[PDB]
């Protein structure tokens, strides 16, 4: 796939520049507003033992990648749906149309929505952004969950300190959410030029290994 291999080269480039080892790091000069992401995952629920993975995007739409490799998205109007078949065929319908064949999946998505609404907090709820994607694939390690969106964006959420990266290969940009929920969006090639802090550098090193894993899968 194109977007992942571009992302890999982009990450390699920044990491090969050893950006945290500059005399003076000038991270702020690498900031670029035109590169702020439009979509990212604000909440997620791993029910992969039985059903699949539920998630909410920053616009309050919710999606599920089911164990059977199909996907369902509920738009933030709370009635419109997009169903994506195993083979990639997408169709639009409504919850209120009550399609008997999809009622199980609709019920499961509503459960995920309701659970995330009452029991999880929204990630990146303060971000000012600059079609809706679905979750292509995901996996987790001991320290992070990795989410690959259909627009090419890769998001990595670190468990131990609540930090997050949103990587976009189209904009060649990374958005970093630190422990304080402070966020900044950087052009990768400008990080090469101006440097960055040790903690973003280490997470970009981790990100590269994660993109390797996604590619070797694929």
Curated annotation (Swiss-Prot):
Subcellular location: Nucleus; Chromosome, Centromere, Kinetochore; Cytoplasm, Cytoskeleton, Microtubule organizing center, Centrosome; Cytoplasm, Cytoskeleton, Spindle
PTM field: Ubiquitinated by the anaphase promoting complex/cyclosome (APC/C) in anaphase and following DNA damage, leading to its degradation by the proteasome. Ubiquitination is mediated via its interaction with FZR1/CDH1. Ubiquitination and subsequent degradation prevents entry into mitosis and is essential to maintain an efficient G2 DNA damage checkpoint.
Chain residue ranges for the region called Important for interaction with phosphorylated proteins: 162-164
Positions bearing Phosphoserine: 5, 80
Record-listed cross-link Glycyl lysine isopeptide (Lys-Gly) (interchain with G-Cter in ubiquitin), residues: 122
Region (Linker): 123-131
Induction of expression: By growth-stimulating agents.
Reported effect, residue 45 to A: Loss of centrosomal localization and of S-phase progression
Domain spans labelled POLO box: 40-118, 134-216
Residue numbers bearing the Phosphothreonine modification: 128
Tissue specificity comment: Placenta and colon.
Domain notes: The POLO box domains act as phosphopeptide-binding module that recognizes and binds serine-[phosphothreonine/phosphoserine]-(proline/X) motifs. PLK1 recognizes and binds docking proteins that are already phosphorylated on these motifs, and then phosphorylates them. PLK1 can also create its own docking sites by mediating phosphorylation of serine-[phosphothreonine/phosphoserine]-(proline/X) motifs subsequently recognized by the POLO box domains.
Noted disease: Defects in PLK1 are associated with some cancers, such as gastric, thyroid or B-cell lymphomas. Expression is cancer increased in tumor tissues with a poor prognosis, suggesting a role in malignant transformations and carcinogenesis.
Subunit structure, interactors included: Interacts with CEP170. Interacts with EVI5. Interacts with FAM29A. Interacts with SLX4/BTBD12. Interacts with TTDN1. Interacts (via POLO-box domain) with the phosphorylated form of BUB1, CDC25C and CENPU. Interacts with KIF2A. Interacts with CYLD. Part of an astrin (SPAG5)-kinastrin (SKAP) complex containing KNSTRN, SPAG5, PLK1, DYNLL1 and SGO2. Interacts with BIRC6/bruce. Interacts with CDK1-phosphorylated FRY; this interaction occurs in mitotic cells, but not in interphase cells. FRY interaction facilitates AURKA-mediated PLK1 phosphorylation.
Family note: Belongs to the protein kinase superfamily. Ser/Thr protein kinase family. CDC5/Polo subfamily.
The protein's role, per its UniProt record: Serine/threonine-protein kinase that performs several important functions throughout M phase of the cell cycle, including the regulation of centrosome maturation and spindle assembly, the removal of cohesins from chromosome arms, the inactivation of anaphase-promoting complex/cyclosome (APC/C) inhibitors, and the regulation of mitotic exit and cytokinesis. Polo-like kinase proteins act by binding and phosphorylating proteins that are already phosphorylated on a specific motif recognized by the POLO box domains.
Designated name of the protein: Serine/threonine-protein kinase PLK1
Organism in which the protein naturally occurs: Homo sapiens
Lineage start: Eukaryota, Metazoa, Chordata, Craniata, Vertebrata
